Design an enzyme around this catalytic site. Structure first.
Site, PDB file in Angstrom:
ATOM      1  CB  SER A   1      -0.969  -2.366  -8.254  1.00 28.34           C
ATOM      2  OG  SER A   1      -1.438  -3.359  -7.345  1.00 28.34           O
TER       3      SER A   1
ATOM      4  CD  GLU B   1       1.072 -34.309  -3.591  1.00 31.12           C
ATOM      5  OE1 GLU B   1       1.098 -35.554  -3.713  1.00 31.12           O
ATOM      6  OE2 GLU B   1       0.212 -33.599  -4.153  1.00 31.12           O
TER       7      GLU B   1
ATOM      8  CE  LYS C   1      -8.167  -7.499 -14.471  1.00 25.20           C
ATOM      9  NZ  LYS C   1      -7.327  -7.422 -13.138  1.00 25.20           N
ATOM     10  CG  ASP C   2      -9.987  -8.869  -7.398  1.00 28.72           C
ATOM     11  OD1 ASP C   2      -9.272  -8.829  -8.446  1.00 28.72           O
ATOM     12  OD2 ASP C   2      -9.590  -8.316  -6.349  1.00 28.72           O
TER      13      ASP C   2
ATOM     14  CG  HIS D   1      -2.243  -0.964   0.541  1.00 26.68           C
ATOM     15  ND1 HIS D   1      -3.240  -1.385   1.392  1.00 26.68           N
ATOM     16  CD2 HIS D   1      -2.474  -1.579  -0.652  1.00 26.68           C
ATOM     17  CE1 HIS D   1      -4.044  -2.212   0.742  1.00 26.68           C
ATOM     18  NE2 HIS D   1      -3.603  -2.341  -0.500  1.00 26.68           N
TER      19      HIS D   1
HETATM   20  C1  HEM Z   1       0.048 -16.114   0.943  1.00 26.79           C
HETATM   21  C2  HEM Z   1       0.782 -15.802  -0.358  1.00 26.79           C
HETATM   22  C3  HEM Z   1       0.503 -14.434  -1.009  1.00 26.79           C
HETATM   23  C4  HEM Z   1      -0.567 -13.628  -0.921  1.00 26.79           C
HETATM   24  C5  HEM Z   1      -1.835 -13.833  -0.119  1.00 26.79           C
HETATM   25  C6  HEM Z   1      -0.353 -12.548  -1.662  1.00 26.79           C
HETATM   26  C7  HEM Z   1      -1.372 -11.514  -1.799  1.00 26.79           C
HETATM   27  C8  HEM Z   1      -1.039 -10.445  -2.763  1.00 26.79           C
HETATM   28  C9  HEM Z   1      -2.047  -9.479  -3.136  1.00 26.79           C
HETATM   29  C10 HEM Z   1      -3.435  -9.469  -2.656  1.00 26.79           C
HETATM   30  C11 HEM Z   1      -1.428  -8.583  -4.088  1.00 26.79           C
HETATM   31  C12 HEM Z   1      -2.061  -7.426  -4.769  1.00 26.79           C
HETATM   32  C13 HEM Z   1      -2.749  -7.861  -6.080  1.00 26.79           C
HETATM   33  C14 HEM Z   1      -1.833  -8.599  -7.041  1.00 26.79           C
HETATM   34  O1  HEM Z   1      -0.990  -8.040  -7.708  1.00 26.79           O
HETATM   35  O2  HEM Z   1      -1.939  -9.771  -7.162  1.00 26.79           O
HETATM   36  C15 HEM Z   1      -0.035  -9.021  -4.204  1.00 26.79           C
HETATM   37  C16 HEM Z   1       0.933  -8.290  -5.069  1.00 26.79           C
HETATM   38  C17 HEM Z   1       2.374  -8.672  -4.926  1.00 26.79           C
HETATM   39  N1  HEM Z   1       2.902  -9.807  -4.254  1.00 26.79           N
HETATM   40 FE1  HEM Z   1       1.895 -11.209  -3.242  1.00 26.79          FE
HETATM   41  N2  HEM Z   1       0.856 -12.673  -2.384  1.00 26.79           N
HETATM   42  C18 HEM Z   1       1.386 -13.860  -1.822  1.00 26.79           C
HETATM   43  C19 HEM Z   1       2.654 -14.513  -2.159  1.00 26.79           C
HETATM   44  C20 HEM Z   1       3.631 -13.612  -2.819  1.00 26.79           C
HETATM   45  C21 HEM Z   1       4.759 -14.086  -3.294  1.00 26.79           C
HETATM   46  C22 HEM Z   1       5.106 -15.565  -3.252  1.00 26.79           C
HETATM   47  C23 HEM Z   1       5.480 -13.085  -3.791  1.00 26.79           C
HETATM   48  C24 HEM Z   1       6.821 -13.190  -4.489  1.00 26.79           C
HETATM   49  C25 HEM Z   1       7.940 -13.541  -3.537  1.00 26.79           C
HETATM   50  C26 HEM Z   1       4.789 -11.970  -3.675  1.00 26.79           C
HETATM   51  C27 HEM Z   1       5.354 -10.649  -4.060  1.00 26.79           C
HETATM   52  C28 HEM Z   1       4.293  -9.714  -4.506  1.00 26.79           C
HETATM   53  C29 HEM Z   1       4.555  -8.552  -5.158  1.00 26.79           C
HETATM   54  C30 HEM Z   1       5.942  -8.033  -5.543  1.00 26.79           C
HETATM   55  C31 HEM Z   1       3.408  -7.930  -5.419  1.00 26.79           C
HETATM   56  C32 HEM Z   1       3.300  -6.613  -6.169  1.00 26.79           C
HETATM   57  C33 HEM Z   1       2.935  -6.940  -7.616  1.00 26.79           C
HETATM   58  C34 HEM Z   1       2.565  -5.740  -8.472  1.00 26.79           C
HETATM   59  O3  HEM Z   1       2.001  -4.776  -7.981  1.00 26.79           O
HETATM   60  O4  HEM Z   1       2.798  -5.759  -9.675  1.00 26.79           O
HETATM   61  N3  HEM Z   1       3.592 -12.212  -2.950  1.00 26.79           N
HETATM   62  N4  HEM Z   1       0.095 -10.105  -3.412  1.00 26.79           N
HETATM   63  C1  UQ2 Z   2      10.071 -37.038  -0.504  1.00 25.20           C
HETATM   64  O1  UQ2 Z   2       9.484 -36.280  -1.539  1.00 25.20           O
HETATM   65  C2  UQ2 Z   2       9.869 -34.965  -1.459  1.00 25.20           C
HETATM   66  C3  UQ2 Z   2       8.887 -33.920  -1.004  1.00 25.20           C
HETATM   67  O2  UQ2 Z   2       7.575 -34.285  -0.667  1.00 25.20           O
HETATM   68  C4  UQ2 Z   2       7.453 -34.739   0.689  1.00 25.20           C
HETATM   69  C5  UQ2 Z   2       9.295 -32.461  -0.991  1.00 25.20           C
HETATM   70  O3  UQ2 Z   2       8.444 -31.623  -0.613  1.00 25.20           O
HETATM   71  C6  UQ2 Z   2      10.703 -32.033  -1.394  1.00 25.20           C
HETATM   72  C7  UQ2 Z   2      11.197 -30.568  -1.347  1.00 25.20           C
HETATM   73  C8  UQ2 Z   2      10.668 -29.841  -0.099  1.00 25.20           C
HETATM   74  C9  UQ2 Z   2      11.149 -28.631   0.401  1.00 25.20           C
HETATM   75  C10 UQ2 Z   2      10.475 -28.049   1.632  1.00 25.20           C
HETATM   76  C11 UQ2 Z   2      12.340 -27.937  -0.246  1.00 25.20           C
HETATM   77  C12 UQ2 Z   2      12.521 -26.499   0.269  1.00 25.20           C
HETATM   78  C13 UQ2 Z   2      13.710 -26.344   1.244  1.00 25.20           C
HETATM   79  C14 UQ2 Z   2      14.074 -25.060   1.698  1.00 25.20           C
HETATM   80  C15 UQ2 Z   2      15.223 -24.841   2.654  1.00 25.20           C
HETATM   81  C16 UQ2 Z   2      13.312 -23.870   1.220  1.00 25.20           C
HETATM   82  C17 UQ2 Z   2      11.658 -33.090  -1.844  1.00 25.20           C
HETATM   83  C18 UQ2 Z   2      13.049 -32.689  -2.210  1.00 25.20           C
HETATM   84  C19 UQ2 Z   2      11.249 -34.549  -1.883  1.00 25.20           C
HETATM   85  O4  UQ2 Z   2      12.073 -35.420  -2.229  1.00 25.20           O
HETATM   86  C1  UQ2 Z   3      -4.801  -2.554  -6.909  1.00 25.06           C
HETATM   87  O1  UQ2 Z   3      -4.085  -3.781  -6.839  1.00 25.06           O
HETATM   88  C2  UQ2 Z   3      -4.758  -4.718  -6.061  1.00 25.06           C
HETATM   89  C3  UQ2 Z   3      -5.704  -5.694  -6.684  1.00 25.06           C
HETATM   90  O2  UQ2 Z   3      -5.930  -5.639  -8.032  1.00 25.06           O
HETATM   91  C4  UQ2 Z   3      -4.938  -6.438  -8.638  1.00 25.06           C
HETATM   92  C5  UQ2 Z   3      -6.405  -6.728  -5.841  1.00 25.06           C
HETATM   93  O3  UQ2 Z   3      -7.193  -7.531  -6.367  1.00 25.06           O
HETATM   94  C6  UQ2 Z   3      -6.196  -6.801  -4.379  1.00 25.06           C
HETATM   95  C7  UQ2 Z   3      -7.031  -7.884  -3.655  1.00 25.06           C
HETATM   96  C8  UQ2 Z   3      -6.658  -8.239  -2.209  1.00 25.06           C
HETATM   97  C9  UQ2 Z   3      -7.573  -8.786  -1.298  1.00 25.06           C
HETATM   98  C10 UQ2 Z   3      -9.007  -8.995  -1.711  1.00 25.06           C
HETATM   99  C11 UQ2 Z   3      -7.130  -9.111   0.131  1.00 25.06           C
HETATM  100  C12 UQ2 Z   3      -6.858 -10.598   0.356  1.00 25.06           C
HETATM  101  C13 UQ2 Z   3      -5.872 -10.785   1.524  1.00 25.06           C
HETATM  102  C14 UQ2 Z   3      -6.166 -11.641   2.597  1.00 25.06           C
HETATM  103  C15 UQ2 Z   3      -5.179 -11.809   3.725  1.00 25.06           C
HETATM  104  C16 UQ2 Z   3      -7.472 -12.403   2.643  1.00 25.06           C
HETATM  105  C17 UQ2 Z   3      -5.225  -5.801  -3.745  1.00 25.06           C
HETATM  106  C18 UQ2 Z   3      -4.903  -5.778  -2.287  1.00 25.06           C
HETATM  107  C19 UQ2 Z   3      -4.521  -4.784  -4.591  1.00 25.06           C
HETATM  108  O4  UQ2 Z   3      -3.721  -3.982  -4.058  1.00 25.06           O
END
Ligand code: HEM
Ligand code: UQ2
Ligand code: UQ2
Ligand code: HEM
Ligand code: HEM
Ligand code: HEM
Ligand code: UQ2
Lengths: 53, 48, 61, 105, 378, 111, 75, 49, 108, 53
Positions: free
Chosen positions: E204, E270, E226-227, E200
């Protein structure tokens, strides 16, 4: 001390919102009925007799 | 192994019919609201 | 019986959010039943393996 | 000057066309990523350029939204592509670098 | 004044989903953030209902899972929604990270770094999830994984035995994994809020990578709907999976109860870890394998330092696009190899793909950015 | 928000006292305006072009007198309730609400 | 943070809009629509497609070598 | 104090009714013919003879 | 500017436990709010460690609770801290509500 | 491009903070040692021989 809301305007206000408060209650009722499948209330409706007897 | 087999496919049938009705509708709802933006026309009118 | 049609729906029921809601709730009730039976029958036709067989075994209870 | 320079120039022209900002009426400098040096250069722009730059970005974001693109004749032509930001950016960097030299002694 | 704008509680809502200035040009790819939001709640809700019948004891673990699918009313969908939702959670997770990479979104350091923590957390979460039914794959998966930690010099044996609660994946280990699998998603949520908090400060990014202050729209009609349309698409995918092919992404062996003496010839994760799995076994070393396994995920934290281009997004950069798509293609190879035995072809291709993964992110992509800058005379 | 809030309030919940004020403000405006040869001459000319008659003050009074709250909420409803506005903005308008939102302020979910 | 009215400075830009109830949700949907998707496809194939076929090929070859390897003639 | 409470919670994840290790299995050699690998359960782990 | 005051995350902390303007004369009775805070975390922490050995099945429920007190290292304190913490949570809860009642705090 | 932090002042800065960075490491070490009861490291300390042999 709720004598603040007692007068002609408030009385006019109440009436203007009655058809609405009444229709909101019809929404709430049918909504409750249809969501729990109110046997007692439903069985009277022409169609929707999907509980045969 | 899978006793739920039939019932699931009955729901799955319903899931496909519901989606086929819901999907276009939500899409049209969203397009209607995005209309304002899609046909918006811009003009730049600087001094001189 | 076409231009005036969606016009009446709007006039009599969509204008107020009151009726709008009441109509979709009254509309959810009937629709549920029509979609359920209507889809059961489609699931019924493409099959004929389950409880169509019931007529036999039972009755003898 | 000759064959080679034109070949590097045509490779540059080729990348330019492939890059495709031209298709959204953008100029190269409109695509620069905004860090502090850049944020300052934008600030230092004169009224006219600043206004033109906003209209271009707006024209592009709008196009980018409906995923359309400009008619071919309105694409910005390479080397008719005025690098309006460059001199400002250059000076802002030069200013920062001097601060940095002073910070070492 | 209004009510939305002033009320302490509603403010937060208003500032996050109603009046939030959003770029007018974000596309699907921006939907995965809300979709992850939905997947998180879907995982929690079906997850809770399963916990109302599931038993964390080796004696009844599998049986309780079976009890759910035959006896518990509608227990089966709940169970498959859970299972398939976990996969949906990874498809969305991967789209999301990729979207960030292509588009330069990672330049929001805190947001992104928090995102990495969110990735690790749901990964740690899902791994513990899969062990719960106590199937052959649950146990051997649990075994193969945890044991990796024994490669850490001088501390590894004690560490593995500490998390095991014995010398094997036994009673202590299952119950343990239940507890952590219950608490982790709540913590994830608190972190998802901090993720959104940092997001925030800037708002975005958008496809062009160019600032959009010049053309923002309210999140209030445009992105709410759109969401919505997009969540409906997530439901379709999930339901298509659960009501037609609930085992398609599942392993038929996790259906045979754990047997600490029976090692299946199989033995694979998995699907969502298959790429990392492939990277791990590509190395003829115990330490290096796990050192590089870790590095294949933690590298996302190095990405912002390797940004080299003068433009933010990839929209205008062709050379970089090719390299990006080769990364995704290389990740298909990695998962495919990861799901295959360590015999012929598979060893050397999965070995070279591992090198490519790191050559791409660490050397090739940056070099391309420098070249691109140069072509533009920047 | 406040402007739109007032139109809807009047569309649905207009009360009697305020309607008398409205009628009163209108009786004063009518008569205060028709003061001097110039505004009256103008009034005659314009009326005949638009009404074909000259509408005497007594008739305007009669038409005003007939307005009560019910009329206001019925007549405002007809023109305002859930209708599309024409919006024109000029100046520093970054915060002028989006058209959809202005359109959504033209009806109410309470009602 | 953010808000509206505190974003940035903009001058001399007019924006004509039309109410959603006065226009169609799907104007030339198939007419202008399909040409656009083809054009978007052209624009991107050469950047998306190649990496993938390289995998497609590596996949089918990889499978053939493996299965053909567990067979044997003399020795 | 912090050490102690932290140490105690840390220790709670180790031993138990898991001190077992009895086994010491006696294996009859004539039950395994030439060329066969017979597996047994020893101290919760597979033992090959 | 500072770091505490400006950082999105630290702001929250600063505005709640550092620079928060507090009345100079609140007494013990005002402590039960933080004490409930501690009791909540104490209940969660000992609660989690118990969940690492507890079984939710009638067949082994009691036994698992017994397993904790005899076999699990330091399982007994964790178990009693949990049990007694629940009571501590109610003593604090009751002080807190009463404090609010006596002092008129409910006007919020 | 980290050539920004290369010069006499930064070199003076580094030195002024060394006794401190060094003493912080002694804190971290003893702190790690005492908290895990590092057998290897501890057994050398005169008193604190509560592991007899
Ligand atoms: C529980 C997992 C995650 C949740 C709930 C989450 C939720 C969100 C939401 C709601 C947004 C705003 C809308 C959108 O662009 O999609 C967002 C944007 C973003 N998230 Fe996540 N996300 C998660 C995992 C990640 C991961 C894995 C990454 C990468 C390491 C990430 C990095 C970003 C970044 C950089 C943005 C900004 C994107 C942009 O504005 O272009 N987040 N996320
Ligand atoms: C037995 O089958 C296997 C899984 O299923 C149970 C896995 O999930 C993974 C990989 C899992 C993880 C958490 C790797 C990430 C490690 C770090 C430090 C981020 C491997 C290699 C695997 O062999
Ligand atoms: C302007 O860009 C953004 C969107 O458009 C791409 C979104 O759609 C959302 C949607 C996020 C939601 C509904 C919150 C969910 C989080 C939890 C922990 C339930 C956010 C925040 C946002 O910033
Ligand atoms: C706190 C909310 C959650 C609870 C209460 C919960 C509880 C459970 C329970 C009791 C099981 C065993 C029953 C079964 O196997 O079906 C399980 C399995 C699993 N859960 Fe969760 N879980 C939750 C959130 C998650 C999350 C966030 C994920 C990660 C996407 C996740 C992925 C899994 C997986 C992969 C399995 C095993 C596969 C299977 O369904 O058989 N769940 N969970
Ligand atoms: C999980 C349970 C609770 C927690 C964690 C909690 C936490 C707190 C905290 C930290 C404070 C500020 C410091 C203090 O005065 O103690 C506080 C004050 C207050 N709480 Fe609670 N409390 C809880 C239960 C209650 C209950 C049960 C009530 C009464 C229904 C209550 C009503 C109040 C009120 C009115 C105040 C303001 C008191 C004043 O300023 O004088 N809270 N609480
Ligand atoms: C989510 C954090 C918590 C978890 C994971 C948790 C888990 C458990 C478990 C597994 C038991 C059974 C083991 C036993 O009886 O000792 C238990 C018992 C109990 N817990 Fe919790 N609990 C948590 C928070 C709470 C809270 C907030 C309270 C309310 C103060 C609470 C009060 C109790 C009580 C009264 C008992 C039964 C008395 C006893 O200790 O024998 N716990 N809890
Ligand atoms: C000025 O008055 C106040 C105090 O003096 C009586 C406090 O002591 C606290 C202490 C609150 C804490 C430490 C937060 C605990 C909450 C959770 C969820 C862990 C607060 C908020 C307060 O306002």
């Amino acid at each position: 001390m709720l004598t603040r809301f007692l007068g002609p305007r408030y009385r006019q206000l109440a009436r203007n919102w009655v058809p609405t408060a009444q229709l909101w209650g019809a929404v709430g009722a049918v909504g409750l009925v249809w969501a729990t499948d109110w046997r007692l209330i439903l069985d009277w409706v022409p169609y929707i007799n999907g509980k045969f007897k | 192994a899978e006793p739920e087999h039939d019932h699931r496919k009955r729901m799955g049938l319903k899931m496909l019919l519901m989606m086929g009705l819901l999907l276009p509708l939500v899409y049209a709802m969203k397009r209607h609201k995005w209309s304002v933006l899609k046909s918006r026309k811009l003009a730049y009118r600087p001094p001189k | 019986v076409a231009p005036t049609l969606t016009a009446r729906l709007y006039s009599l029921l969509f204008r107020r959010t009151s009726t709008f809601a009441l109509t979709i709730v009254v509309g959810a009730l009937f629709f549920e039943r029509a979609f359920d039976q209507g889809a059961d029958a489609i699931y019924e036709h493409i099959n004929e393996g389950k409880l169509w067989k019931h007529i036999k075994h039972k009755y003898e209870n | 000057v000759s064959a080679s320079s034109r070949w590097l120039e045509g490779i540059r022209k080729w990348y330019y066309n492939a890059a495709g900002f031209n298709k959204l009426g953008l100029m190269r400098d409109d695509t620069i990523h905004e860090n502090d040096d850049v944020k300052e250069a934008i600030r230092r722009l004169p009224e006219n350029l600043y206004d033109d730059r906003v209209f271009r970005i707006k024209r592009a974001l709008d196009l980018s939204m409906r995923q359309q693109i400009l008619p071919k004749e309105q694409w910005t032509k390479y080397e008719e592509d005025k690098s309006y930001l460059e001199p400002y950016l250059k000076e802002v960097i030069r200013e920062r670098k001097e601060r940095e030299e002073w910070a070492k002694k | 004044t209004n009510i939305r704008k002033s009320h302490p509680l509603m403010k937060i809502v208003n500032n996050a989903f109603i009046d939030l200035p959003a770029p007018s040009n974000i596309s699907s790819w921006w939907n995965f953030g809300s979709l992850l939001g939905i997947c998180l709640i879907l995982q929690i809700l079906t997850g809770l209902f399963l916990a109302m019948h599931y038993t964390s004891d080796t004696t009844t673990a599998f049986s309780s899972v079976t009890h759910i699918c035959r006896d518990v009313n509608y227990g089966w969908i709940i169970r498959y929604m859970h299972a398939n939702g976990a996969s949906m959670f990874f498809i969305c997770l991967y789209m999301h990270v990729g979207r960030g990479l292509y588009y330069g979104s990672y330049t929001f350091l805190e947001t992104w770094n928090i995102g990495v923590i969110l990735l690790l957390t749901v990964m740690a979460t899902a791994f513990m999830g899969y062990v719960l039914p106590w199937g052959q794959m649950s146990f051997w998966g649990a075994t193969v994984i945890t044991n990796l930690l024994s490669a850490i010099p001088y501390i590894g044996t004690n560490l593995v035995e500490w998390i095991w609660g014995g010398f094997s994946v036994d009673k202590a280990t299952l119950t343990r994994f239940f507890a952590f699998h219950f608490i982790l998603p709540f913590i994830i949520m608190a972190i998802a809020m901090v993720h959104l908090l940092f997001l925030h400060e800037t708002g975005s990014n958008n496809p062009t990578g160019i600032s959009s202050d010049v053309d923002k729209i309210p999140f209030h009609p445009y992105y709410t709907i759109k969401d919505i349309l997009g969540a409906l698409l997530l439901i379709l995918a999930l339901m298509l999976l659960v009501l037609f092919a609930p085992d398609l992404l599942g392993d038929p062996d996790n259906y045979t109860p754990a047997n600490p003496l029976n090692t299946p010839p199989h033995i694979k994760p998995e699907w969502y870890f298959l790429f990392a799995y492939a990277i791990l076994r590509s190395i003829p070393n115990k330490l290096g394998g796990v050192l590089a396994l870790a590095f294949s995920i933690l590298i996302l934290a190095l990405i912002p330092l390797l940004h080299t281009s003068k433009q933010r997004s990839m929209m205008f950069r062709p050379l970089s696009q090719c390299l990006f798509w080769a990364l995704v293609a290389d990740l298909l190879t990695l998962t495919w190899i990861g799901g295959q035995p360590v015999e012929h072809p598979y060893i050397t291709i999965g070995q070279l793909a591992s090198v490519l993964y790191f050559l791409l992110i660490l050397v090739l992509m940056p070099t391309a950015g420098t070249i691109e800058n140069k072509l533009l005379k920047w | 928000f406040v402007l739109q809030g007032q139109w809807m309030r009047l569309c649905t919940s207009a009360t009697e006292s305020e309607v008398l004020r409205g009628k009163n403000l209108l009786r004063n405006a009518l008569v205060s305006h028709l003061d001097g040869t110039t505004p009256v001459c103008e009034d005659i000319g314009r009326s005949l072009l638009t009404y074909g008659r000259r509408i005497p003050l007594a008739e305007w009074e009669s038409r005003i007198a007939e307005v009560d709250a019910r009329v206001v909420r019925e007549v405002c409803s007809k023109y305002f309730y859930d209708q599309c506005p024409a919006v024109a903005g000029f100046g520093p308008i970054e915060q002028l609400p989006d058209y959809n939102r202005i359109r959504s302020g033209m009806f109410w979910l309470r009602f | 943070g953010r808000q509206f009215g505190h974003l940035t400075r903009v001058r001399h830009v007019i924006t004509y809009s039309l109410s959603p109830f006065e226009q169609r949700a799907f104007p030339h949907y198939f007419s202008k629509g399909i040409p656009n998707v083809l054009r978007r496809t052209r624009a991107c194939i050469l950047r998306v497609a190649p990496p993938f076929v390289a995998f497609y090929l590596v996949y089918t070859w990889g499978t053939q070598e493996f299965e053909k390897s567990k067979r044997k003639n003399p020795a | 104090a912090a050490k102690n409470v932290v140490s105690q919670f840390v220790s709670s994840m180790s031993a138990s009714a898991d001190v077992l290790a009895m086994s010491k299995i006696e294996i009859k050699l004539s039950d395994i013919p030439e060329g066969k690998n017979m597996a047994f359960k020893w101290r919760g782990k597979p033992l090959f003879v």
